[PDB]
Design an enzyme around this catalytic site. Structure first.
Site, PDB file in Angstrom:
ATOM      1  N   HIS A   1       0.812  -1.213   0.000  1.00 48.56           N
ATOM      2  CA  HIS A   1       0.000   0.000   0.000  1.00 48.56           C
ATOM      3  C   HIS A   1       0.848   1.267   0.000  1.00 48.56           C
ATOM      4  O   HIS A   1       0.281   2.340  -0.191  1.00 48.56           O
ATOM      5  CB  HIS A   1      -1.075  -0.002   1.089  1.00 48.56           C
ATOM      6  CG  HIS A   1      -0.606   0.129   2.503  1.00 48.56           C
ATOM      7  ND1 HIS A   1      -0.091   1.276   3.062  1.00 48.56           N
ATOM      8  CD2 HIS A   1      -0.677  -0.762   3.480  1.00 48.56           C
ATOM      9  CE1 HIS A   1       0.155   1.045   4.354  1.00 48.56           C
ATOM     10  NE2 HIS A   1      -0.189  -0.193   4.633  1.00 48.56           N
TER      11      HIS A   1
ATOM     12  N   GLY B   1       2.409   5.817  10.182  1.00 50.43           N
ATOM     13  CA  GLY B   1       3.815   5.649   9.843  1.00 50.43           C
ATOM     14  C   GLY B   1       4.405   4.330  10.339  1.00 50.43           C
ATOM     15  O   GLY B   1       5.564   4.038  10.044  1.00 50.43           O
TER      16      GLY B   1
ATOM     17  N   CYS C   1       3.369   1.260   9.609  1.00 48.11           N
ATOM     18  CA  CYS C   1       3.281   0.130   8.699  1.00 48.11           C
ATOM     19  C   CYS C   1       4.661  -0.337   8.280  1.00 48.11           C
ATOM     20  O   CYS C   1       5.592   0.440   8.112  1.00 48.11           O
ATOM     21  CB  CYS C   1       2.428   0.480   7.494  1.00 48.11           C
ATOM     22  SG  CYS C   1       0.697   0.555   7.990  1.00 48.11           S
TER      23      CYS C   1
END
Ligand SMILES: *[C@H](O)[C@H](C[C@@H]1CCNC1=O)NC(=O)[C@@H]1CC(C)(C)CN1C(=O)c1cc2ccccc2[nH]1
Ligand SMILES: *[C@H](O)[C@H](C[C@@H]1CCNC1=O)NC(=O)[C@@H]1CC(C)(C)CN1C(=O)c1cc2ccccc2[nH]1
Ligand code: NA
Ligand code: NA
Lengths: 301, 301
Positions: free
Chosen positions: B41, B143, B145
């Site tokens: 993503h 932030g 991920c």
């Protein structure tokens, strides 16, 4: 979101852990520059542990009596000295993995990370608070002595604790890195008692703010209390007095949530008097006091 | 003694964390040998996040669109490919700090350590269980991920989780390191619900054994139950069925304490029906299910 007991990343401290053996006693040491720090009780024996004269015991040692191992490499000890309840072993090699560091002493009510180690090998990391009575509720087995506690700020490791002993109650005692005990404890083979403990009020309030930030609101109410009326309730439930400095420290969290500290204090009073009535806050059914305001801001900002 | 939620030392994983940027999105990646793994993503935009066609989005990318930073050094991307919901970015440098590792998928009810990271920089470490409903109750902000979950055995890091998303309920979802989601979740900008959760019975029993080993005995009784009679109560309180394999897995703890698993089951039944009556177990006022039998043996042996 979410709120978890959270330790600092332990890598910088892992690179400092070594094994120290004297006689048949093995424990951990902390290798910074060309010095290894460890508990002085490494030089005690079963014959002399009830009340060792450590000065005499160290005089009778030589450098070669200390076996220091960093992974699969023996470090040559070239000097030894006593620093209160810590031994300083000068070695012939500076640790190349030495981080930027400081030796700080912490206050009761503050938190730190513990890197539990056995045989110089890191085993686990957890977070602890220094209790009002200068103990910590840790997790330590035989061989864990010399494990350290620390905080990290930017790239700098602030070492605040070295592990020395377990009390009869199952809580833990140790020193700062200058070898000075936290609390009225001594490094001998005796059963020792800590003073009566208390609950860290400012931390409970911080955790209530964490809860609000994370969507737990059931314990909120429209009431506010005075600082003096709150402290009357605090005393009754064995909570520490809340001060204006604490109110100030909670300011950011109060601003973020829009809930005045004395508004939150009315919630805390109600929880102390009435309990939770079957509900939970951040996954707990009791009031949690081992998160500082700083700890909360770190996960909740 | 003592019993704390305990994470693995995080150093070996810290040495693998990098920052990955595509467009205006920055998140974390895992750098092993000459490959960086991250959530796919990272290539989505605000214009196309409700239901991205990732195959199309990746076809439209080039190597130079990926900015990979390891500390203060840019790593040159020389290849890119999709692996389910993970991107693999081939880089021109093998990570010199690559540990021995494996990619494992874990089962619901098992635990792992999370190294929370922001901008490729490790921030904290905590322990999590994979819930029956394939979520985790973590602590993750914007932030985070690409932060990973792992276990360590000897010198080998078993990576089991990479972080991708937060559900409306505030719990967390992600993939294994092959990019396959845990649970019925998809990497798009939509509100998704997890299945109903349940309590991990075998873990609760393990924690009760931990409590006994640590001197908490108030909940013990002279009674034993059958496996079938216990499972009748389990079902009623939304606890998973206990199986003979679970009884077997608890064998070491049963041997250590001298308390048969079906003896401890009678305690658990009583606690479910009656509550704690104002008492605590290992510092908790609720029954804890995020410690495995292995986790208990590690601190209680
Ligand atoms: C160091 O590895 C060890 C760690 C203990 C072992 C079990 N869990 C721990 O935290 N420390 C000790 O064994 C220290 C060394 C001494 C200071 C000499 C004594 N000691 C104690 O913990 C100790 C002795 C003793 C006697 C009676 C009651 C309690 C008690 N604690
Ligand atoms: C990655 O850094 C970020 C981590 C989240 C941010 C807050 N806490 C976290 O754990 N992930 C996301 O933002 C992911 C990326 C997408 C998969 C594209 C969507 N997303 C979600 O977490 C997300 C979107 C969305 C919409 C509606 C309700 C919930 C919801 N979660
Ligand atoms: Na109020
Ligand atoms: Na029983």
């Amino acid at each position: 979101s979410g709120f978890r007991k959270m330790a600092f990343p332990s890598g910088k401290v892992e690179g400092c852990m070594v094994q120290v053996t004297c006689g048949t006693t093995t424990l951990n040491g902390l290798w910074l520059d060309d010095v290894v720090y460890c508990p002085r009780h490494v030089i005690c024996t079963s014959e002399d542990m009830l009340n060792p004269n450590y000065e005499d015991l160290l005089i009778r040692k030589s450098n070669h009596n200390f076996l220091v191992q960093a992974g699969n490499v023996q470090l040559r000890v070239i000097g030894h000295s006593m620093q209160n309840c810590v031994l300083k072993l000068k070695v012939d090699t500076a640790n190349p993995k030495t981080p930027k560091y400081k030796f700080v002493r912490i206050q009761p009510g503050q938190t730190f990370s513990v890197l539990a180690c056995y045989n110089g090998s890191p085993s686990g990391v957890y977070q602890c608070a220094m209790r009002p009575n200068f103990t910590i509720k840790g997790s330590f087995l035989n061989g864990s002595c010399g494990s350290v506690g620390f905080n990290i700020d930017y790239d700098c490791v602030s070492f605040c604790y070295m592990h020395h002993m377990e009390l009869p109650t199952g809580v833990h005692a140790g020193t700062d890195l200058e070898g000075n005990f936290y609390g009225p404890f001594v490094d001998r083979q005796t059963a020792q008692a800590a003073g009566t403990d208390t609950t860290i009020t400012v931390n409970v309030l911080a955790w209530l703010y964490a809860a609000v930030i994370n969507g737990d609101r059931w314990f909120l109410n429209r009431f506010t209390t005075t600082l003096n009326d709150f402290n009357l309730v605090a005393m009754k439930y064995n909570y520490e007095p809340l001060t204006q400095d604490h109110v100030d420290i909670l300011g950011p969290l109060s601003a973020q949530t829009g809930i005045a500290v004395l508004d939150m204090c009315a919630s805390l009073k109600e929880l102390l008097q009435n309990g939770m009535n079957g509900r939970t806050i951040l996954g707990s059914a009791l009031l949690e006091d081992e998160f500082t305001p700083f700890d909360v801001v770190r996960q909740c900002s």
